């Protein structure tokens, strides 16, 4: 029975190319939503996400992370790969593991997903064959549409044919990610995985789909910075986001063995069903509850030991309500001092690779020791009684964190994660 | 580690809406690839699929599976949730396990997927959007095409409430699905575990993806159940297949103590990556060689204990003869009367079902001591030295089953099932 820690941080993100300057703007209270432009949204009533930057100059490039003869086949693939091949080649490199022998690369296993994929893949080539009509798409529409295609081509890149999976569970796919490839080293059966997820759900389609469940926030389309309220009372939907986060795992003496870097170590998982609708919560949050206090049990670790939570925390006003509810039956009476924060608040909800992205800001606050604020928090809805971290950072001791993903299906994982010297 | 046993079965396949019917015909040599309708193939060629019966009278409905007020929400979501749903409620009834209380619900768990998921709903919902240009869709548009949907809807219906999960690895989905839902069990974190894959991708854009990669037959649409021939030398590619198969896993005590039915042990899982290309298959079989001597490994079995092989056998020039030739590597020597079998010969490749699908075939030549045909197999390539059970079933001693699934991405998983009475 193995522990597993964290060697690798890999981010793609609305705030930041990398993991330094996408964590330095969470810190310092950046948002990364915008106004879409790459397509019209004249007739949709949402105009605005968290998009990753494409400028000339500074912008997300293929070629920042790809060998000049990779390009173009990598060109091909949706961009959910382009994101997810950015993210986990700065983990990777990273965490320094690039083996050259058969027993490492055996030992090595993948565990990366996207909640939704390739869609404007999808989208695309379906439009363009109903308009040529000719019975012809490229021949790489398949496996640039393939969820499993991200974790396909790092194993490639890398060598890596241990496990070669994913996980896909919407709005929590990254962290079940994650939480399934800790399982998968300390049951024996990989030494380090690769895991994560990685999204690029806004296209018209996309946003026209979350418009129609009114799942998004469309109100502030004048005011992007302005949409994403985690617990406002102004809160009104989220904001759909695009990027990836992707961490290398590792088992522990195999880390310390060769020297690796130590973020931390996840010591708790735990993953649950509401079993009660399509897309809306439970009433009682009894799926989240559950994973929150699983995930601690799993960590043998009680509640007044957790210091930070990053939450769900997406902005819509029943969401925010039963998970706010759910947290505070579960932490206030036993640690009415911890803090809690939702850095969707600055990014916007990444679908499938919030958990993961998540996950390593959680491992950033123990290497910092500071909580990412709630941006827009001004005024709070009236059943707050902890810290939410408003608007500003606030340094903090934060020996231990706990990450909570929820998504429609009403499926729910928790992940706990500990400093390494406590 | 606690053992694993399969305790319910569930089908839907071309060639039967159940297990009883698809078996039957299965065993009895009949196919089920036709001549595609629903859509016009003129353009298209390959024009052939393993489809499920939609005739009036006898084709499948959702309304033989599905409570009255459940059908309107149901109808709304993508074929490949109709199939498994269909499937997973055949499986849940036949296991019996249909708990009120809540510490039961609670261990009960999900694992789910599909290889490409909602691809209809999408192509279908982009299309329409294209054309309407009014910046809506359907409210029920992103749970339709989630891949995580089946899991959610059978959560819902049965209030299980235990880890709401998927696996989404392409052609080896519904192999990696109950693998990974063995592994949940046999470390701890459920007692029973809902588990495999579901696929309804015989859509346009669908079947000129697979064109465009040369990945299908396109040579016998004048005689479709002539088409799919693994391992003979006229095989020139896989036909699309469409259909769902789900099974219940459960701790082995549990089982027994609430006295259920048990088809046999789940002892083994191999799951490597070929770490090689995109959507041809490693040259030298290494991921496929690993994953079964992997999971014979996993087993604590050798090779010489395996009765028959249900082989990946898609009807490809070169994956046919590289399974061909990693199996003969791993057997001939050691267990030269080995039976091995493609029923893809029979229904074709369900993707993502594939894998569960054929794990049912595989227990149920255990219950009925019988391998099933490998058809069309009229000139075998000259590398064969194992009875591939050409033509006809053959009744044998069958107690120890291997199960191969291989996929884009080069993802490979390998399944050992074991008869309960040893
Ligand atoms: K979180
Ligand atoms: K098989
Ligand atoms: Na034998």
Chains 1, 2 share one sequence.
Not at 133 to 152: D, Q, R, Y
Not at 158 to 185: E, K, L
Not at 240 to 255: D, P, S
Not at 294 to 323: C, F, K, Q, R, W
Request: glycine share 10%.
């Amino acid at each position: 029975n193995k522990r597993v820690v964290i060697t690798g941080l890999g981010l793609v993100t609305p705030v930041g190319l990398n993991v330094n300057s996408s964590w330095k703007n969470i810190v310092d209270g950046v948002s990364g939503i915008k106004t879409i432009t790459e397509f019209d949204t004249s007739k949709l009533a949402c105009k605005i996400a968290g998009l990753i930057d494409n400028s000339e100059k500074d912008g997300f490039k293929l070629e920042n992370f790809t060998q000049a003869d990779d390009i173009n086949r990598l060109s091909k693939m949706d961009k959910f790969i382009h994101y997810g091949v950015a993210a986990a080649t700065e983990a990777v490199e990273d965490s320094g593991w690039l083996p050259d022998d058969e027993k490492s690369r055996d030992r090595t296993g993948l565990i990366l997903g996207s909640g939704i994929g390739g869609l404007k893949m999808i989208e695309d080539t379906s439009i363009k064959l109903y308009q040529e009509n000719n019975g012809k798409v490229s021949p790489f529409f398949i496996p640039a549409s393939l969820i499993n295609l991200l974790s396909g081509l790092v194993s490639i890149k890398y060598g890596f044919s241990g496990p070669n999976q994913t996980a896909v569970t919407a709005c929590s796919t990254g962290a079940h990610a994650i939480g399934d490839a800790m399982r998968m080293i300390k049951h024996g059966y990989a030494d380090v995985m690769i895991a994560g997820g990685a999204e690029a759900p806004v296209t018209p389609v996309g946003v026209a789909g979350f418009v129609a469940a009114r799942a998004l926030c469309t109100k502030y389309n004048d005011n992007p910075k302005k949409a994403s309220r985690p617990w406002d009372k102004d809160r009104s939907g989220f904001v759909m986001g695009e990027g990836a986060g992707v961490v290398v795992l590792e088992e522990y003496e195999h880390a310390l063995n060769r020297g690796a870097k130590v973020y931390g170590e996840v010591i708790g998982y735990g993953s649950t069903g509401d079993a009660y609708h399509m897309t809306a919560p439970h009433p009682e949050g009894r799926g989240a509850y559950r994973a929150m206090r699983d995930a601690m049990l799993d960590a043998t670790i009680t509640p007044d030991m957790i210091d930070y939570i990053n939450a769900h925390g997406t902005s819509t006003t029943l969401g925010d309500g039963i998970e706010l509810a759910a947290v505070q039956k579960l932490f206030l009476e036993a640690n009415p001092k911890v803090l809690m924060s939702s850095t969707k608040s600055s990014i916007g909800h990444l679908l499938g690779a919030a958990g993961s992205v998540e996950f390593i800001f959680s491992a950033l606050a123990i290497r910092d020791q500071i909580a990412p604020p709630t941006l827009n928090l001004d005024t709070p809805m009236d059943e707050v009684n902890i810290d939410l971290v408003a608007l500003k950072a606030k340094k903090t001791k934060i020996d231990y964190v706990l990450s909570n993903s929820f998504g429609f299906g009403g499926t729910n994982a928790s992940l706990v994660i500990k400093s390494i010297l406590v």
